[PDB]
Amino acid sequence: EKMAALEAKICHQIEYYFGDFNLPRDKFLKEQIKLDEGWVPLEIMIKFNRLNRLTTDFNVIVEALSKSKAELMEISEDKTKIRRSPSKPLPEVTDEYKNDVKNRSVYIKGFPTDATLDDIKEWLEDKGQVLNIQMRRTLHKAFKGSIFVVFDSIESAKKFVETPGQKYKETDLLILFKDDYFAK
RNA sequence: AUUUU
Numbered sequence: 001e002k003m004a005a006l007e008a009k010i011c012h013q014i015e016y017y018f019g020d021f022n023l024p025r026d027k028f029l030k031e032q033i034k035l036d037e038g039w040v041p042l043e044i045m046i047k048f049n050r051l052n053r054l055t056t057d058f059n060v061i062v063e064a065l066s067k068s069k070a071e072l073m074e075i076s077e078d079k080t081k082i083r084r085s086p087s088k089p090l091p092e093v094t095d096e097y098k099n100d101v102k103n104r105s106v107y108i109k110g111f112p113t114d115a116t117l118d119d120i121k122e123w124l125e126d127k128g129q130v131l132n133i134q135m136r137r138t139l140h141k142a143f144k145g146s147i148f149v150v151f152d153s154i155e156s157a158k159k160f161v162e163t164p165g166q167k168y169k170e171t172d173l174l175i176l177f178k179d180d181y182f183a184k
Numbered sequence: 185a186u187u188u189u
Binding site (some may be wrong): 013016017025026027028031032046047048049050051052060113117121132133134135137141 | 185186187188189
């Protein structure tokens with residue numbers, strides 16, 4: 001277990017960077033990918049903060065992916081560069097789709113300003129497949145305590161949004177669809 | 185060029 005859990009964290013992080021949600025908004029990455037038919041050096045990858053926190057060891061990152069479930073990433077011949085499989089292009093961002101991403105967006109208020117992505121990640125663990133967590137922030141770049149969660153499907157969004165209890169382990173939360181939130 | 189580069 002504990003090792004397998006960690007190798008999965010490694011995978012999911014790399015897969016989030018190159019994911020459908022994050023890549024379109026990742027100028028640094030979008031750039032790197034243009035320099036070599038999409039390949040990016042693990043030497044530059046270990047630079048990413050959240051990945052680095054887990055490991056800076058190239059082989060470890062390679063075993064972790066070699067054994068992925070999403071199978072969205074590609075490892076190079078010399079096992080030093082990785083990339084998003086060309087056979088898995090990014091979506092055609094249409095209005096029908098920009099709209100559907102909104103319907104899958106939920107707002108939650110009541111998170112201790114001193115909570116981290118892993119605190120929020122942990123709590124969401126068994127509440128539905130999520131594609132993105134947005135920690136809202138002030139001007140001083142501080143965590144407002146409120147966030148935006150994007151789920152993989154409306155079904156799990158609606159199930160979530162429509163659950164009574166919804167208390168953050170002791171505290172109580174405000175849970176609305178990103179849409180309503182703008183009744184402000 | 186770290187708002188999960």
